[PDB]
Structure formats: structure tokens, C-alpha cells
Amino acid sequence: MDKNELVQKAKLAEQAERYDDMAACMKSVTEQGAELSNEERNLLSVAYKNVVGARRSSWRVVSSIEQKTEGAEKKQQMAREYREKIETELRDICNDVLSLLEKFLIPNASQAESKVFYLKMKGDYYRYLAEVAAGDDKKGIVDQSQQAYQEAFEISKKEMQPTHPIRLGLALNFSVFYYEILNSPEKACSLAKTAFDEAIAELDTLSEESYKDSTLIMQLLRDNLTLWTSDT
């Protein structure tokens, strides 16, 4: 019953906004080898999103500071060295998740829905590494992210309805990968427009349990499009 005790402790941590504790509980749950339920999947997801999100946010702040301190040698070197410290934290977190995904979650995914969720997750966290990589390792990191998303994308178009929030969220994140990581706005826009339009055409497939998530994600897709179509 150690698993159900660890799950309850993780929701205590989330209520307390102690996301390191939350993530450590659900890493322990995952490491017990058994396939996670949807509830456990989501708490593993929420936890690591918050722990990695803190570092991404800090990384962007300090990265912008080190750009704005060009010509001020001592301040820019301090921003750089701090930015590198945050990156080391950011990388260890991503590598922690990517290990769980490859050692436990992907190989145990019995169902199509689980499989595209965890492959989306694999693309997301390689993308966070890509946001921060430079040079040698960046090519391979970009490649891992792309390959995870595509497989997820193909499975989700073959098995899920166009209004399913996991299918829609995957399209949203895949488009942002094309826009932000591969610098291909046309493909990003087309992948987002297509996903939006295929959802609009079958709104009879919305379920009451998930239609709120489905309609929000559709709005986010269209917002990304509106942002990208006024620049490019």
C-alpha cells in the first residue's frame, strides 16, 4: 500500500505548492514499475511541469539580463555564469523525466491514449532541453524531440478524435516546436490551423468530461496562429 500512501502525500505537497516534494513522491510511484493510472499520470505531469517551469522562467529572466548587459563585462559574465547554473538544474530535471519516460512509462503504455501522452511528454522535455542547448548536442536533442512528437502525432491522428485534449495539446506543442525550435513558421501555422479546423468540424465529438480543456486548447491554437500571422 506504499504506492497509495505516496500518491496521497503528493497531493498534500501540491496543496502546499511544494512541487519538489510532489515530484519526488510521483517519481517513487513511477519507479515501482507498475503502469500509472490517469490520476497518477496527471500528478506526475503537474509536479514536473512546475519544477521545470520555475527553472525555465528563471532561465529566461537571466538570459535576457545577460543580453541587456552587452558591453558591461563584469555584469554580463555574472549573468552568464548564473544562467549556466540554472541550465545545469534545468538539464538534470529534464534528464530525470526522460529517464522515467524511457525506463518505465513509454514501455509500459498499454493503451494508445497513454502512449501518445507519454510521447508528447517526451517531445516536450526534449524541447525544453533544446531551448537551452547549443552546438554539438543541439542537433540530436532537436531530433529526439521531433521524433517523439511525430510518433505521438501519427498515433493520435489514427486513434483519437480531433477534439480530444491530448490530441489537441500535442498539436499545439508540436506547432510551437516547429515555430520556436526549428524556426519554420509556415509549418507551425499549418499544423495549428489544421488541428483547429479539424476540431471545429466535429464538435459533436466533444465529451462533457473534457470539453472545457478541448475548447481552451482550441482557443490557444488560434491565439498562436494570430500571433504568428501578424509577424510572418
Partner: peptide, 10 residues
């Protein structure tokens, strides 16, 4: 602005 990803709230 920023690119929307989901789930959100970094």
C-alpha cells in the same frame, strides 16, 4: 508575446 503550450502555468 509568448508561445502557448499546454498544459500551461510555468
Amino acid at each position: 508575446r509568448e508561445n502557448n503550450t499546454h498544459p500551461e502555468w510555468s
